[PDB]
């Protein structure tokens, strides 16, 4: 039993099954409030064999991430692609607080760094249906039956509630590539001004953290006299003790379903229903360089509008799809009048955002301010300003979407209007956001 590699474990049914069970390889991850914890219900049928490769090179690997709610994902040793795939679920299910140490203002930047001292034994691969090979992983009949039952409900709201329960029980993503072995991880976060040389800061933090893990102290001082708080994780102790040390790929659970059902599940998971309506020019505001338009007529009951826009053609109305419940982050937030010396609104729930400044006096008790709503942080992506006007007291920004090549990150071109200089004092932070196109479901009979 000396010099056993992953091949010996896999070839032996007892040892192979012990590896599968002890590592929860048949279970998905539930990106919940507590982080990426595996589900307790098996998602796939037990394979007859595992595909694996052997790698025994021990080193220190450092990784950096700049997404906001990916602290726990980094703590689990998710590479860049896995964190990218898992970010929507963590962001949607995360717990928000205005006292978050992470900062991503226009002038300050924040980043998580993680150093892993690895003792690898190999990598294990799972074949997803989209790959097109013959040894695909088959979903357990229980999960398929649950999906069928969820989609068979009478009302769209019931379908969505059933799907939400199913994905909270079975998990949101499935780990398709995993690294077996032992690891010692050290994680930290750093905030710095954008003016500083980013490469120098990254190198300094990496050197400090790698020295910390290599010499394995809650506080580490780098060569630049940066005090970093370091969180340590031990996953090392004989094949009986090998554990998953790194995740190289995760596939969304919804992506494992067949295409006709995958489309329906994806559509029903969209937080908001959208609609295009006509607009009317706001009276007054003749000083401003551009016209301001708002939804025309009464807002249909149950729907909401997002803000003032410079578009003279149409406006987007959105309606939540999931009823509000305790322990669940609403898709939209209501706004309240500011404390004093400002007519602008403030988001009721922390970390939320709204797209445009209010061109008037905001009063949540009466329309059209009653139906103005913010957005959950996972719904929006930073935009780019276009300034109109030639004076500080009259210039206004139009928030155009940032062009991207992949449709996955496309945003609505609502042309939200922001005011360059808000009179008074104590105004809310200026919005610089655009709404994701993937978060809105159109043309539904609902």
């Amino acid at each position: 039993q000396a010099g056993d590699t992953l091949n010996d474990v896999i070839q032996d049914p007892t040892r192979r099954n012990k590896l599968i069970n002890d590592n929860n390889l048949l279970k998905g991850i539930i990106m919940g409030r507590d982080g990426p914890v595996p589900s307790s219900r098996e998602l796939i049928v037990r394979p007859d064999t595992l595909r694996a490769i052997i790698n025994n090179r021990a080193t220190i690997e450092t990784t950096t991430m700049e997404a906001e709610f990916t602290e726990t994902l980094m703590e689990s040793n998710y590479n860049s692609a896995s964190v990218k795939v898992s970010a929507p679920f963590i962001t949607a299910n995360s717990e928000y607080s205005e006292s978050s140490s992470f900062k991503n203002t226009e002038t300050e930047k924040s980043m998580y760094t993680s150093s892993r001292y690895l003792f690898p034994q190999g990598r294990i691969d799972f074949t997803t249906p989209d790959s097109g090979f013959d040894d695909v992983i088959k979903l357990s009949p229980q999960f398929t039956s649950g999906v069928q039952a969820a989609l068979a409900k009478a009302t769209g709201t019931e379908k969505r509630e059933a799907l939400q329960n199913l994905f909270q029980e079975y998990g949101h993503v499935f780990r398709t590539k995993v690294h077996i072995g032992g690891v010692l991880s050290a994680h930290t976060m750093e905030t710095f001004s954008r003016s500083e040389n980013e490469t120098e800061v990254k190198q300094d933090v990496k050197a400090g953290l790698e020295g910390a893990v290599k010499g394995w102290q809650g506080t580490i001082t780098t060569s630049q006299n940066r005090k970093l708080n370091v969180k340590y994780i031990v996953n090392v102790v004989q094949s009986e003790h090998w554990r998953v040390i790194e995740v190289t790929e995760v596939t969304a659970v919804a992506d494992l379903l067949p295409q006709p059902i995958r489309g329906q599940v994806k559509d029903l998971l969209k937080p908001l229903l959208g609609k295009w309506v006509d607009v009317e020019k706001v009276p007054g505001l003749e000083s401003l360089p551009v016209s301001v338009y708002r939804p025309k007529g009464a807002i249909p009951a149950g729907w909401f509008w997002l803000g003032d826009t410079a578009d003279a053609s149409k406006a987007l109305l959105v309606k939540p799809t999931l009823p509000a419940r305790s322990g669940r982050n609403p898709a939209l937030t209501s706004l309240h009048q500011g404390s004093g010396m400002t007519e602008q609104p403030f988001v009721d729930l922390p970390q939320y955002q709204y797209l445009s400044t209010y061109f008037g006096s905001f009063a949540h008790d009466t329309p059209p301010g009653s139906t103005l709503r913010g957005l959950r942080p996972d719904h929006v992506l930073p935009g780019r300003y276009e300034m109109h006007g030639d004076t500080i007291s009259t210039a206004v920004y139009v928030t155009r979407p940032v062009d991207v090549p992949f449709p996955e990150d496309e945003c609505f071109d609502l042309k939200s209007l922001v005011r360059v200089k808000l009179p008074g004092s104590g105004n809310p932070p200026k919005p610089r956001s655009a709404l994701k196109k993937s978060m809105v479901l159109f043309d539904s009979g609902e």
Binding site: G340, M341, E343, G360, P423, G424
Partner: protein, 135 residues
């Protein structure tokens, strides 16, 4: 004396109109923007309305060569409720004293007033900006 001068900038940061009433310069004169030689009568500011996001400038100063500062008063009034008084502003930059007076009196919770920029130590009373907000 032209040395004694004051500039009051009423800035309506709210969304509702405000009115100026009973503007009276007991001493000195009201002059054009930056031209103390261009006298202006109080009628040009009596009853004017500062629409939201507008700035209205009142320049007051003493006579050219005289031991006479400039003192005056006016009332910010709300035209939405029958010209109800909002505040009573009184300024005094005297030639014969080293202390300048700028007093905002009256009270009604429906309005918020924030003034800044005054100088009460010596010399001219300075430029004063008054933000008004119907809230």
């Amino acid at each position: 004396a032209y040395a004694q001068w004051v500039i009051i900038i009423i800035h309506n940061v709210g969304s509702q109109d405000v009115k100026i009433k009973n503007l009276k310069a007991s001493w000195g004169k009201l002059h054009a923007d930056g031209d103390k030689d261009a006298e202006v009568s109080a009628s040009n500011y009596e009853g004017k309305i500062v629409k939201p996001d507008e700035k209205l400038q009142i320049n007051a100063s003493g006579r050219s060569d005289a031991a006479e500062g400039t003192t005056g008063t006016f009332d910010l009034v709300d035209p939405a409720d029958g010209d109800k008084q909002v505040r009573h502003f009184y300024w005094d930059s005297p030639w014969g004293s080293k202390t300048n007076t700028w007093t905002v009196s009256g009270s009604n919770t429906k309005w918020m007033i924030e003034y800044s920029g005054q100088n009460l130590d010596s010399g001219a009373l300075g430029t004063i900006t008054v933000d008004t907000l119907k809230k």
